[PDB]
């Protein structure tokens, strides 16, 4: 199955508890540190040994994180380990942020341009995107010399291409016919 199909129940349970107790910020840090720690090459190896029991894998991961996990977050790691799903931690953190972003009415937007775009232009783009998405947009600008001009915006599955590269492809498709 897709890792997203298996991490949905755990991400939803952690989000409902964090929301009901007003701990939304705390759990973003706990899940983020568990995700990062579970992917380091010595922890990645310890979480695959055949002689360790589920409780020892959970305890080892709890001791490494230490103070970056409250009592509820420790009960959650013990639950994920007992159900044999510690490989889902990076995906659980990713899905928890999606639920939190839609709760706070915010959207993460990726932007690529031919040349560096100034703060005035970034805010001008953000204003329009916020109006159509009816969400607080957070832009992540980046450079791509492949484009000969313009910008390409992407927010989830929505893709708006204003780059002259895309315009040159449309011109080609209309003349090759």
């Amino acid at each position: 199955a897709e890792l997203t199909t298996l991490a949905r129940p755990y991400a939803k349970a952690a989000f409902e508890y964090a929301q009901a107790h007003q701990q939304l910020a705390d759990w973003s840090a706990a899940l983020g540190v568990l995700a990062a720690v579970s992917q380091d090459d010595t922890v990645r190896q310890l979480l695959k040994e055949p002689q360790l029991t589920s409780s020892a894998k959970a305890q080892s991961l709890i001791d490494v994180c230490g103070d970056k996990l409250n009592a509820p977050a420790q009960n959650f790691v013990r639950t994920v380990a007992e159900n044999k799903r510690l490989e889902l931690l990076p995906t659980i953190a990713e899905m928890y942020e999606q639920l939190k972003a839609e709760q706070e009415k915010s959207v993460e937007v990726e932007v690529t341009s031919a040349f560096t775009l100034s703060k005035e232009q970034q805010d001008k783009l953000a204003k329009a995107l916020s109006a159509r998405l009816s969400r607080e947009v957070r832009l992540h600008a980046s450079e791509d010399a492949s484009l000969i001009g313009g910008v390409i915006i992407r927010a989830g599955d929505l893709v708006i291409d204003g780059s002259v590269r895309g315009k040159l492809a449309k011109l080609a498709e209309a003349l090759k016919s």
Partner: protein, 68 residues
């Protein structure tokens, strides 16, 4: 990143046991088939040595284990 020096310092104290590429551990036993963890260097059709002078042959080299 999220890996603080404290977190990095704690990870170095873990009792992570190193496995040689020529060694493995029996995970399950059933109907004449033995599944083994490790054996990173074993070749398809190679002979495997178990305790008490018993021998097996590696036939399934899967991503996480060897079926002998």
């Amino acid at each position: 990143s999220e890996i603080s020096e404290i977190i990095k310092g704690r990870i170095e104290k873990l009792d992570v046991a190193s496995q040689a590429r020529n060694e493995g551990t029996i995970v399950s036993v059933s109907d004449g088939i033995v599944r083994i963890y490790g054996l990173a260097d074993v070749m398809y059709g190679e002979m495997i040595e178990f305790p008490g002078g018993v021998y097996g042959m590696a036939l399934n080299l899967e991503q996480d284990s060897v079926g002998a």
